[PDB]
Amino acid sequence: DGTCVNTNSQITANSQCVKSTATNCYIDNSQLVDTSICTRSQYSDANVKKSVTTDCNIDKSQVYLTTCTGSQYNGIYIRSSTTTGTSISGPGCSISTCTITRGVATPAAACKISGCSLSAM
């Protein structure tokens, strides 16, 4: 329990939310903190910080200041990035400052990836 701004989402007994907003999310053993915002998304044994996530599935992953849209994260670490209609796995995948749409990352030198695999949703 914490400074959640939960509308109608689920946050399990061992999940946590702090100064963050939740809209019909399903947060299972997961952490939604520091102005994170979720909308109709599944978090499972995962952590999210200052990110805005919509219709996503985030399993055993860590997410920081990222914009998840209609995408899946599975065993990854992702920061300062945007993902649209994607499925991203490793495990131990690492992503920094990327923009990714249906399995294709932008060719910008700002995008870093290590130990990862990308796919279309």
CA distances from 7 to 23, 33, 63, 83 (A): 6, 15, 22, 25
Name the superfamily (CATH) of residues 1-121: Insect antifreeze protein (2.160.10.20)
What span, in angstroms and rounded, lies between the C-alpha atoms of 54 and 5?
16
65, 33, 101, 69: CA torsion to nearest 10: -130
Classify the C-alpha dihedral 11-13-17-18 as positive or negative. positive
What span, in angstroms and rounded, lies between the C-alpha atoms of 48 and 40?
15
Asked how this structure was determined, the answer is NMR
Token duo for residue 75: 């065993």
In the chain, where the domains are located:
1-121
